[PDB]
Amino acid sequence: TEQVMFQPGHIVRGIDFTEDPLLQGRLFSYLDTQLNRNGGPNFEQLPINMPRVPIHNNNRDGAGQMFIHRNKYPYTPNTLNSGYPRQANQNAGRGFFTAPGRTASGALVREVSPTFNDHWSQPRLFFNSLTPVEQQFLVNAMRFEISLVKSEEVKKNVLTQLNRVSHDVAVRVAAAIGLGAPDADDTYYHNNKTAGVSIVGSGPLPTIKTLRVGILATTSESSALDQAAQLRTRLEKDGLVVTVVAETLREGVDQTYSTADATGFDGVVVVDGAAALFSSPLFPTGRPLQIFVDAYRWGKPVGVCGGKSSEVLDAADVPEDGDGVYSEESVDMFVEEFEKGLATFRFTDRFALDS
Amino acid sequence: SPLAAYEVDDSTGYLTSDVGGPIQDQTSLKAGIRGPTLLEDFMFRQKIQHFDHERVPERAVHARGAGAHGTFTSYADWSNITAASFLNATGKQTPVFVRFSTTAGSRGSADTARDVHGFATRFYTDEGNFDIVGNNIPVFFIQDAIQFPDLIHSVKPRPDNEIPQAATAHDSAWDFFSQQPSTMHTLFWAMSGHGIPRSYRHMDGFGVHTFRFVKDDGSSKLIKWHFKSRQGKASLVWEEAQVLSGKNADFHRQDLWDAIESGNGPEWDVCVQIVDESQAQAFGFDLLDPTKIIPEEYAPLTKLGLLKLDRNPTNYFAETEQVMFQPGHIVRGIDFTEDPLLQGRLFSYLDTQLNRNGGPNFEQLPINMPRVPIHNNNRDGAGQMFIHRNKYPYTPNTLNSGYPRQANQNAGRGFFTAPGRTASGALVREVSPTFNDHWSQPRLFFNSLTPVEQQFLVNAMRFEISLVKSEEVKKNVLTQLNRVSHDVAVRVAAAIGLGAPDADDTYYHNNKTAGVSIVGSGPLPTIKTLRVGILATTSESSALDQAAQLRTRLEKDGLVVTVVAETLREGVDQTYSTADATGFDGVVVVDGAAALFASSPLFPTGRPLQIFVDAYRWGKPVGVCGEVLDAADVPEDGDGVYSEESVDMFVEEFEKGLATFRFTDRFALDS
Amino acid sequence: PLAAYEVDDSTGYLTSDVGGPIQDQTSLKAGIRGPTLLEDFMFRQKIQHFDHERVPERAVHARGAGAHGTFTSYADWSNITAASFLNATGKQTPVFVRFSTTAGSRGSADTARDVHGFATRFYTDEGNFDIVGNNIPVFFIQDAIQFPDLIHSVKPRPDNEIPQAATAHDSAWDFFSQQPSTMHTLFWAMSGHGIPRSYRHMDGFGVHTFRFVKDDGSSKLIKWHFKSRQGKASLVWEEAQVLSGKNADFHRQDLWDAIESGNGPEWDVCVQIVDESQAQAFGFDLLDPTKIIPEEYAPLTKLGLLKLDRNPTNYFAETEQVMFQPGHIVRGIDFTEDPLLQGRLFSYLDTQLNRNGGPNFEQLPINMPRVPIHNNNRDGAGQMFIHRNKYPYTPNTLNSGYPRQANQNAGRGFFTAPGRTASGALVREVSPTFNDHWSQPRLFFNSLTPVEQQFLVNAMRFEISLVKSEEVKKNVLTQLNRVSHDVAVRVAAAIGLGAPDADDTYYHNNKTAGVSIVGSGPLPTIKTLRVGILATTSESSALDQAAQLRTRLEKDGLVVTVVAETLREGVDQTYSTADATGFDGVVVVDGAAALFSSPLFPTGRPLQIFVDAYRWGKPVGVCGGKSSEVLDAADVPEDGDGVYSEESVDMFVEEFEKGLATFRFTDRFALDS
Ligand code: HDD
Ligand code: HDD
Ligand SMILES: [Ca+2]
Ligand SMILES: [Ca+2]
Ligand SMILES: [Ca+2]
Ligand SMILES: [Ca+2]
Ligand SMILES: [Ca+2]
Ligand SMILES: [Ca+2]
């Protein structure tokens, strides 16, 4: 991993570049920068960088040279090595070749093409294509970052640009930073949308295998560990990664509350045998409940398995009828419902919207 | 062998990038047929980036040198004197790589500079790589490694103008020698024919330092390494070496390359002098002092095994340029001594490879790899070529079951420090008083040379010191030379028009030692590979006839024969224009060519005669086969001058001349 | 000039690099005969430094030497270029120049046969401007992508790394014969231009066509020619070979000494100027770096004077570390679409990463500009600057928009010539306008004198006779034959092959001025030329004669060496260290006639110095009146051109100095019939 040295210049017959001026300059950078990383010119000889076919060329020497070349006439044209290696091109040896229809014409210029000039219509196309809660998240990310910018001039300049994409975005961001948005400039505004760029609107996940389920349990109650064990069996059958959490480790418990956090799980289930937990020298005050509350606040499916849910759900201020909130006595029924919630992935109804 | 696995064959196939994509590399990609080159031309940039980065720093010393592969074969099971595995059975073979070199010149400097020469040998043993990084001279200039940059700055070019290349013939070098009297012993060696050996194959190798051989029972003895040439000892003469430097800067590397290709790979007996620990100061000097030899009269040589070089490298850069020797590459059964020069070398050779390689994984280069598995917790670093499977690379561990396990005297055939070694006393930056005699051994050496050999050494000093500008440095030089020998100080002073200081007999003596003289070492034990230049003409069918008959008689005896004429044709190897006496160990004129020795657009005026005269002047066997001796002012009754009409009689005499190698009666001596 | 970076060590106690006073002569040991301690930081810092002194040699032109100087403009050149260093009569700009061979490594000999570098940095008031040129005005190849092929072929064979600093081997001649573009440069390299007498006696050429660009945007096509004020002069091959052994440092020593003696070398910096419309008007393509513009079509314009007059203080820091780039360009100059130049622009920025080990190589003193730097380049290994601006991005408001963009209309920016265009397909194809590889090599050959043509034939005979492959030798003859049938026959004769039948497609009888060395007339100055006076200590009168001659010769700025058997007052060198390659002329004092055996020098040495000097074409003579003993022993005719015999010291010197200006007496060399 550390030594792999990628290059867009690693191209093969059948593919070619275009005159995108960002691409064009990348071709230079990635060959040059490996000299810095490797400290020498033979970086293509590192195992991870070697090809899976023979190499025939007249590159020689350099620090770290791992090959012993037999050909003592490494120049072209030669007769003393019978003209080998042979030149490869479109018509011989499956050579790389530049697409032969490509041309250039005109002055040699350090000028930007005016065809590149619209910087704002596509940002607006993207923004239009997000769902309402998704738009809020994006606005909230800009509110977070721009609020940390100390320069009032920079913040003003940021609103001028945002406003060219969307007046509404500029207004909503402006609100968090106590500035006024500039007046609407509609040159690049439009209502068009495009498919396939929204995350929130891309539907339930097509698989839940590998998703993480934290089962919050206790060692106080033999019944809580038995519930956790039955739940584990039923959930592992479906390829979910189960972590049972309790105050201390023992057979069948994976993690202590001291080390557990909601960020470690895609869904959180409390076994009702553990209801009393929801102070110890064994974990920070309020840790078990905090894991559940965090999971709920962040949009994750959450539930209580065993039949008695109101004590846990009330302590967490989580409504029993909420979408992505589950309560069943039946392990089988619980898992069926909960797995739908894992595919939904995020319950976006739990997030406030600008009015 | 790690080397075979890394060989790359390019005798067939289409050109590819370094990642296997077929490409071309002859024309840049351009915007139009007369347009500017495009940045998107990855074929151009990958090829030119490689070229731009081909060079690595040359070695800080011994930058000029050449290498070969071979084998070392043990003569015996040496368990009685060392635990070393490569020496533990009669007939045991270990692959070797040797690099020979000069010391001061940069990597493109001439082979035939006057200098100390390196002789570095790696044994790829079955218990790890073992290097003996030696020189052709058994003693070194300085007594403490911390002084190495002082010595080297002083002999390398002056740092304002970088003049002169590959030469001690300048003020700074003689200033250092004259201020630092430890230098005298090596200076005397370097000013003798040992400074200008005939080839890498005609010199010995020495470890220089006292080392230890350590047995499995923990006991130790003190040793010196001496690699003894089976080709014999031979030198150039200085005027010849100077011309050779210009005519063929590659003379020694070519000589070695050719000897191997012709099935005449050079051989050395690897030997040691072995003495007891109790004898560290028994011989009148301290065995920790790298400026002293053990005279062979006090400790004879034991022959351990045969070193033979018999395969040239495939890629000089990959193998010769990249080989990274270290005296730290040591194996169980060998230990260090407290020689302060050796002690500091241990640090320098591990560090300097970082400069050369540009990263820490230099031991992974094929030429540096061992021939046994590597098990350790060294990780990462630029240019990491391994993928380690052990994800717990720390000791002590349980998560990898405690592997790799520690090796030591009693486990895993570990290296161990000789357990009889101790240290005692204050922590000091002081020189031992036992190191103080800087002059008796230089005198011993000088006493052991033949009279004309002594004359050559005097003349080398006369040559160099006459090029020192500073009158003060020259006077300081004579002061030191005088402490070795009043006669040397007098004779050198005569050349520079200064007066030698009065005799100071503190360190004068008349003792001699065997095995250090080149001239005195007798005729060469073999003449195979030696070079005979036959000077012929195309203007005579007789001349090319006589040449061809000689060629048959000389070639079946293993000699390398070059027939020289005005222009090339069948049977002619070299034109007069490219020929020079430095190219031959003996020169023969066929009498059918006599008119050439009396102008041509095909070679410089007087070239044929000059070859013959130079060869004579430089002491080589010379002869006419069939006025040539008159034209050359060469006495027909001179030793090593041959004149016969019989082809077989000429060759028999001439080949005795080749064994004698140099006819030293042709050189004037001081009265 | 770089005074600000100098470190003086003429006084003081030894310190570490962090200024702690220390010693550095004895290691710290556990006991007087004990092992060395790891805690000895004095030892480790000194040895670590030494262990890391070396840097990679340049990939080409590794062997070279440099000096500082000044360029002075002769006019305000505003009417043809916006270049600031050229904008006023007498305007001065500091320079640094490095001269070099091309193929050999560090330590190889100065007097190898090779193309030579002549790289000049102008530290101008609008940025560093480098002209990275050679002593030969044409290059071997037509596209930069071929450079590694050319260089691999001429450098040592990569199995054994033989031979050093030489094109005399199979691979080089294989390449030349398979790549016929190489013919023009090859003919230059095989002439005396491959073995110049010194860096001061050769010219410098930019090789490529460049552009001069006026402030109004208009451009003209130019070629740079730096014309030596010392004259042109070469060695003879046989002399070059001996000198390579006797003094590998000959060119660097010559330059160093000329500067120290107040004889710093000079060149007129010139250009040929032509219109954009004349790119294909001269019967070849100006984008083709294998072609010259004959001076009969475009005369030289003298822009200013380049004089080198100060030697470096530290060779490594200054000469070894100087990192030239043709991308060091200034407003008023632009590139052309020469495909060899085009690729160079990439190579010289990249290769300094290898040499320097990191990206801040422009910070080394020798590479720094003499104006302020304002940019957003940051960090990198060895960063010496402490940048104040904490907003190094454009566009910014937080640093008020600085640094400001510079361009044609603001801030005296560099700008690409605005009349330049490109058209057509993206192609890896060679222009057919580049296809004539042979007519200009013939033009060059035709322009040499007869003995000069012989010398070039003899260089080829020498090198090609060392090529082992009979297929390569035949292919070589094929190519030489396309330039000249006569060249091919004469070369063939030495290698015992037959030349192929004449192929007259490219044959012609045109000549051009200014390329011949032999034909360039006597040297305009003899200052710095070397005269060896061969004398003896046997006769106090020979020393007297030598002293008199010295006084008379030194008065005219010649460097005089008196040689005798042994050193004493008045004697500079002994016979043992003397050689004819050390002198431009040789005089024997007639009191020393007897020397023409000793333990003090090799047999025949005094005579050999004289005979060598004669056979290599140098002025030689005997001063005093008794000359026949010496001249007869040397087989030198008393009536020979360049052979002097006079009793009168004054008269001897007058005649001898005319001979030093003639420099070489070419009538001593045999010619093919
Ligand atoms: C403390 C510094 C120091 C000292 C005192 C010595 N050397 Fe050393 N030597 C080096 C520091 C060094 C080095 C800088 O580390 C080199 C440069 C390249 C390398 O691998 O190590 C080296 C290279 C080197 C080579 C070249 C190996 C090769 O061919 O690649 C030989 C033969 C020697 N040395 C031999 C000796 C001998 C016989 C010494 C005295 C007994 C000696 N050196 C003292
Ligand atoms: C595309 C590769 C390439 C090509 C086609 C050339 N060169 Fe170059 N040259 C280099 C790649 C290079 C280099 C590898 O980048 C060097 C090595 C060290 C350096 O700084 O640049 C260099 C060094 C170098 C030096 C040494 C500068 C110094 O003293 O430090 C000179 C004088 C030249 N070159 C001159 C030329 C001329 C007159 C050329 C043809 C017109 C030429 N080069 C073509
Ligand atoms: Ca000096
Ligand atoms: Ca000798
Ligand atoms: Ca590095
Ligand atoms: Ca070759
Ligand atoms: Ca000439
Ligand atoms: Ca521009």
- Closest residue by CA, ligand 2 atom 2: C344
Confirm or reject CATH 3.40.50.720 for domain C526-673, answering yes or no. no
Give the C-alpha separation, C206 to C119, whole Å.
9
Going from the Cα of A35 to the center of ligand 5, the distance in angstroms, rounded, reads: 9
Residue B428 phi, psi dihedral angles, 5° rounding:
-125, 150
Query: From edge to edge, which strands make up the β-sheet containing C585-589?
Result: C573-574, C559-564, C530-534, C585-589, C620-623, C643-646
Q: Is residue C545 within 8 Å of C587, Cβ to Cβ?
A: no
Give the C-alpha separation, B446 to B441, whole Å.
9
- The DSSP string of C276-345 is GGGTTTTSS-TT-TT----TTTS-EEEEEEEEEEE--S-HIIIIIT----TT---TTEE----HHHHHHH
Q: Which CATH number is C427-525 given? A: 1.20.1370.20
Report the gap between the CA of A126 and the closest CA in chain C (Å).
Answer: 25
Atom of ligand 2 nearest to the CA of C66: 29
Going from the Cα of C51 to the center of ligand 5, the distance in angstroms, rounded, reads: 15
Q: Is residue B10 within 8 Å of A85, Cβ to Cβ?
A: yes
Three-state secondary structure call for residue C210: strand
**Given 3-state DSSP classes, what are the helix, strand and coil percentages for chain C, each rounded to the nearest 5?**
35, 20, 50
Q: Does A39 touch chain B (CB under 8 A)?
A: yes
Q: Which CATH number fits domain B1-427: 2.60.40.10, 2.40.180.10, 3.40.50.1820, 2.60.40.1220?
A: 2.40.180.10
Q: Which two tokens stand for residue B196?
A: 């200008």
C2 residue type, one letter = L
Q: Which two tokens stand for residue B262?
A: 């012709």
Q: Residue A106: exposed, middle, or buried by beta-carbon count in 10 A (0-12, 13-18, 19+)?
A: exposed
B244-263 burial string, b = 16+ CB within 10 Å, else e?
A: bbbbbbbbbbbbbbebbeee
Instruction: Find, in chain C, the residue whose alpha carbon is nearest to that of B606.
Output: C615
Q: Is residue B35 within 8 Å of C137, Cβ to Cβ?
A: no
B112 residue type, one letter = T
Three-state secondary structure call for residue B666: helix
Alpha-helix runs per DSSP H in A57-151? 121-128, 132-146
Active site residue: C68, C116, C128, C134, which one? C134
* B358 beta partners: none
Question: Which residues lie with the beta carbon below 6 Å from any ligand 1 atom?
Answer: B 59-62, 65, 99, 101, 118, 120, 133-135, 140, 145, 148, 208-209, 290, 323-325, 341, 344-345, 348-349, 352; C 47, 51
Q: Does A33 touch chain C (CB under 8 A)?
A: no
Instruction: Find, in chain B, the residue whose alpha carbon is nearest to that of A6.
Output: B19
Superfamily of domain B428-526: Catalase, four-helical domain (1.20.1370.20)
A80 and C171 in contact by Cβ < 8 A?
yes
Q: Which of B9, B55, B387 comes nearest A47 by C-beta? A: B387
Q: Which of A72, A102, A107 comes nearest C426 by C-beta? A: A102
- Domains A109-207 and A208-355 in one fold: no
Domain coordinates in residue numbering, chain B: 1-427, 428-526, 527-671
Report the gap between the CA of A184 and the closest CA in chain C (Å).
Answer: 24
Residue to test with chain C: of B156, B312, B429, most C Cβ within 10 A: B429
Give the C-alpha separation, B95 to C171, whole Å.
32
Cis peptide bond upstream of A77, omega within 30 = yes
Q: Angle B110-B113-B114 (CA atoms, 0-180°, nearest 5)?
A: 165
Give the C-alpha separation, B591 to B575, whole Å.
18
Breaks in chain B (C–N beyond 2.5 Å) sit after: 598, 626
The secondary element (H helix, E strand) that includes residue B655 is: helix B647-660
Give the C-alpha separation, C40 to C22, whole Å.
11
Closest to B184 (Cα-Cα) out of B595, B478, B481 = B481
B4 residue type, one letter = A
Q: Residue C483: exposed, middle, or buried by beta-carbon count in 10 A (0-12, 13-18, 19+)?
A: buried
Residue C553 phi, psi dihedral angles, 5° rounding:
-80, -45
Give the C-alpha separation, C413 to C84, whole Å.
12
Breaks in chain C (C–N beyond 2.5 Å) sit after: 596
Q: Is B62 a catalytic residue?
A: yes
Fold exhibited by the domain A109-207: Hemocyanin, N-terminal domain (1.20.1370)
Counting ligand 1 atoms within 8 A of each CB, the residue from B186, B316, B349, B354 with the most, and so the one to mutate, is B349
The CATH class, in words, for B527-671 is alpha beta
Method: X-ray
Three-state secondary structure call for residue C576: coil
Q: How many residues does chain A have?
A: 355
Residue C93 phi, psi dihedral angles, 5° rounding:
-140, 135
Q: Which two tokens stand for residue C253?
A: 């020593």
Instruction: Find, in chain C, the residue whose alpha carbon is nearest to that of B258.
Output: C160
Going from the Cα of C384 to the center of ligand 1, the distance in angstroms, rounded, reads: 33
Q: Angle B260-B263-B266 (CA atoms, 0-180°, nearest 5)?
A: 55
A73 and C171 in contact by Cβ < 8 A?
yes
**What's CA C426's distance to the chain center, in Å?**
38
Work out whether strand B118-125 and strand B128-135 pair parallel, antiparallel, or are unpaired: antiparallel
Closest to B447 (Cα-Cα) out of B485, B495, B492, B491 = B485
Contacts of A147 (CB under 8 A, 6+ apart): A176, A177
Q: Which CATH number is A208-355 given? A: 3.40.50.880
> Which residues, chain by chain, have CB under 5 Å from ion ligand 4?
B 193, 235, 456, 518
Q: Is residue A53 within 8 Å of B16, Cβ to Cβ?
A: yes
Alpha-helix runs per DSSP H in B74-126? none
- Chains that contact B by 3+ CB pairs under 8 Å? A, C
Q: Is residue C64 within 8 Å of C117, Cβ to Cβ?
A: yes
Give the C-alpha separation, B151 to B128, whole Å.
33
Contacts of B189 (CB under 8 A, 6+ apart): B116, B137, B138, B139, B195, B445
Closest to C156 (Cα-Cα) out of B3, B61, A61 = A61
Q: Which two tokens stand for residue C513?
A: 């001025």
Residue A70: how many other CB atoms lie within 10 Å = 14
Q: Is C377 a catalytic residue?
A: no
Give the C-alpha separation, B57 to B626, whole Å.
55
C51 and B43 in contact by Cβ < 8 A?
no
Report the gap between the CA of B401 and the closest CA in chain C (Å).
Answer: 33
Active site residue: B129, B135, B312, B368, which one? B135
B647 residue type, one letter = V
Counting ligand 1 atoms within 8 A of each CB, the residue from B345, B351, B353, B365 with the most, and so the one to mutate, is B345
Q: Which CATH number is C1-426 given? A: 2.40.180.10
Q: Which of C44, C165, C350 comes nearest B52 by C-beta? A: C350
**What's CA C46's distance to the chain center, in Å?**
36
A69 and C174 in contact by Cβ < 8 A?
no
Give the C-alpha separation, A61 to C354, whole Å.
13
Going from the Cα of A252 to the center of ligand 4, the distance in angstroms, rounded, reads: 88
Q: Does A90 touch chain C (CB under 8 A)?
A: no
Q: Angle C309-C314-C316 (CA atoms, 0-180°, nearest 5)?
A: 115
Q: Which of C421, C425, C475 comes nearest A107 by C-beta? A: C421
* C 365-394 → A contacts, CB under 8 A: none
- Closest residue by CA, ligand 1 atom 12: B345
Q: What separation in angstroms does the CA of C396 have from each of A118, B493, B636, C413?
A: 21, 76, 93, 20
Give the C-alpha separation, A121 to A188, whole Å.
5
Report the gap between the CA of B399 and the closest CA in chain C (Å).
Answer: 33
Closest to A98 (Cα-Cα) out of C148, C338, B44, B20 = B44
Counting ligand 2 atoms within 8 A of each CB, the residue from C324, C328, C335, C338 with the most, and so the one to mutate, is C324
* C 270-299 → B contacts, CB under 8 A: 285, 287
Give the C-alpha separation, B201 to B100, whole Å.
10
Q: Give residue for tokens 């609103």.
A: A159
Half-sphere exposure of C474 (CA within 13 A, CB side): 7
Contacts of B276 (CB under 8 A, 6+ apart): B221, B222
Q: Does B300 touch chain A (CB under 8 A)?
A: no
Q: Is residue B607 within 8 Å of B584, Cβ to Cβ?
A: no
A105 and C398 in contact by Cβ < 8 A?
no
Give the C-alpha separation, B314 to C28, whole Å.
44
Q: Which two tokens stand for residue C352?
A: 């300094």
B19 and A28 in contact by Cβ < 8 A?
no
- Chains that contact C by 3+ CB pairs under 8 Å? A, B
A79 and C178 in contact by Cβ < 8 A?
yes
